[PDB]
Amino acid sequence: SSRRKWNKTGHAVRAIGRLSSLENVYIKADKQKNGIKANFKIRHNIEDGGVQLAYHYQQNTPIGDGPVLLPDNHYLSVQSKLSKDPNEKRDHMVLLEFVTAAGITSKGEELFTGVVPILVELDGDVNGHKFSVSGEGEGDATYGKLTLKFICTTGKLPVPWPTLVTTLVQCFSRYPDHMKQHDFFKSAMPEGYIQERTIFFKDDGNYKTRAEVKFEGDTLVNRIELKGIDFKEDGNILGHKLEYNLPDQLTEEQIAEFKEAFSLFDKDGDGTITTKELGTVMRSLGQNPTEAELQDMINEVDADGDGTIDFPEFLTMMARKGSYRDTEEEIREAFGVFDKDGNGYISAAELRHVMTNLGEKLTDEEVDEMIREADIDGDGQVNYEEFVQMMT
Amino acid sequence: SSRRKWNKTGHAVRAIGRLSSLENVYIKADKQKNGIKANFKIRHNIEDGGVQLAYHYQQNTPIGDGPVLLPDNHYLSVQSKLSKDPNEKRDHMVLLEFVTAAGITSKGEELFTGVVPILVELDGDVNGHKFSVSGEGEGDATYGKLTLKFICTTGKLPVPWPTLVTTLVQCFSRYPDHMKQHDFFKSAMPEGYIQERTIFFKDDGNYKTRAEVKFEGDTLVNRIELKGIDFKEDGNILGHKLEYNLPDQLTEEQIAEFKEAFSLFDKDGDGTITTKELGTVMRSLGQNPTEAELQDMINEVDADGDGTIDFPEFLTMMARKGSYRDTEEEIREAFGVFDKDGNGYISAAELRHVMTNLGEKLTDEEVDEMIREADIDGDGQVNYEEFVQMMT
Ligand SMILES: [Ca+2]
Ligand SMILES: [Ca+2]
Ligand SMILES: [Ca+2]
Ligand SMILES: [Ca+2]
Ligand SMILES: [Ca+2]
Ligand SMILES: [Ca+2]
Ligand SMILES: [Ca+2]
Ligand SMILES: [Ca+2]
Q1: Ligand 2 centroid vs A254 CA: distance in angstroms?
Q2: Cβ atoms within 10 Å of B271's Cβ, excluding its own
Q3: Cα of B376 from ligand 8 centre, angstroms
Q4: How close A14 comes to chain B (CA, Å)?
Q5: Domain that holds residue A303
Q6: Domain of B202: which CATH number?
């Protein structure tokens, strides 16, 4: 009776917790400044327990005089992975990021068709501590992918790296087709835009940031001025009490593998999988589902609702871990897909058949290398056990 | 290189696997017979590995002469938990089930407003083996909830219990408001409908079922005739090689707790949570989010897309387990919600405050009992440690 009450009440409270802990970047139109406004919350993990909240308030205004796109209300969804370079002696941060736009049922965008080089430069002043950061890398709006390496050019960074992430190129967000007209960021290019923020760290000081985001030649440049005030000396920021990265995250190798796998489905390379492409892939493997069935298949994983599957969605589908029995069975059926004649052994010809039909061109020697990598008993083919050890 | 190819190819194949392993019940309109047609797949787990597929083909026709509702294409989503009665010596099956309709952006329904008693009777003949099953329980279309106990009245059941589940009252499916007009099952009441199926077990025999589903007085009765043929003597069915239930499932106590918790949000008791009700709950706890923010909160968990949160959705949200740090932090913040004055101790007055504001009326002695259940050091209040042990 008492335990039932405690448990149910706890369930309700935690439910309210999960429902109102959204970390999305919320974007509205700022029609007076002819740009946009944004607001969101960042939750940093504190060493040995706790969370440091950072309230982001944001405004963006066009640099040029050309017409821009003023969006209806929508949001950006962001995934971030922070990592270190073992061969680096300088205070630094390796950053991988995926940003995709949702929330709804130009010339500048043409500048973001392929991979674009990125230069980031920041000069900061937190409680009198001057510092500088230089970063560089690549952005691919197609997949909404960002990959950069930042370095503190003034020695040791006086603030934790995660506090600078949101400050250190939203023009590389992937906007689905039905939302192409709501992309302010790309529409402001090549002239670019000014992005200003106030970031309030709960029970601590705040950042004020002003940034110029524009094309300089072929390079997307983000030049930043940051000013931090009212920070406590032994707070989570100046005291460096924030964790660098999260656990339970996919390694960049996992993400790479999933990226190539996704590339197998994504035929035109527009960064998303349609029913036509999935149907093509399945038809190549001998399965012929109908259009209705294909749409029914897409809808199950189409989280942001656009009738297709982008790369973060594919990532979510393939990172979702079920029961161990589910995994085992998934592997068994996969083996079923590889073993065409159902004779219990995957031959080189069958592996090559599956991979070629998937879209991957590979030679005799490569297929042979794969077989050799898997062939434990050395009989020239891959049985179920070997396949499982290869898949686990 | 080889491992990269193996891994990515495996990822693609498994992706195709997950995308095309949908277990939903797919419903279309059968305009000639003035009823419906349905098709779906059931995956049974085989002992020591493997899956037994069961292809369900279904047709339903009205019994009465009154007009019925012929739906546009949609589907039913089903969750099933099979359990045993320890105090039962007869061959039996305890069944808990949740069915909710989705897939789209009458007088009979009035018969399903509250809890309705259910009687099930089946006579079967599989490979010459006659048998009978009598089941009884309750259905609540509001939550799409079914709870029954079935018993083999002829001794030992010659087929595995899980093979009879789909055969052993889809009129208790929860149809969201925007889909009320697509509910054929309830519209055919009280006269009811005939439901016929052919269920093909891959590499084995098949079932042919004919059922009468109708009201007899106040009781919803499902009378079934089943005929099984072409089964292999040592197959998964006659050989009883199918597993009874899945692991990694919520116990009926967990489901009960989550049910009461859900009841706290569900103010009008219509089986779903709206933005108004969530806003009411949060306002009672001192938080005042806006309408836009409330909708933004709902949309994050609104899987089947109806602008609200039904009980299976709430179940999915609260059964989704994140990192251990996420759990710990969720508990910490929950404690924050309980501890109003932030003094580090949850008092009886505060617990009562939270619970009363949530909607639960409870007395001094009950709150005292809860405190006493949690109060480890016996100081009359609950600190963070005690709260955590209570929540874990
Ligand atoms: Ca594509
Ligand atoms: Ca999508
Ligand atoms: Ca073979
Ligand atoms: Ca071998
Ligand atoms: Ca309600
Ligand atoms: Ca819903
Ligand atoms: Ca207190
Ligand atoms: Ca105590």
Answers
A1: 21
A2: 20
A3: 5
A4: 6
A5: 250-392
A6: 2.40.155.10
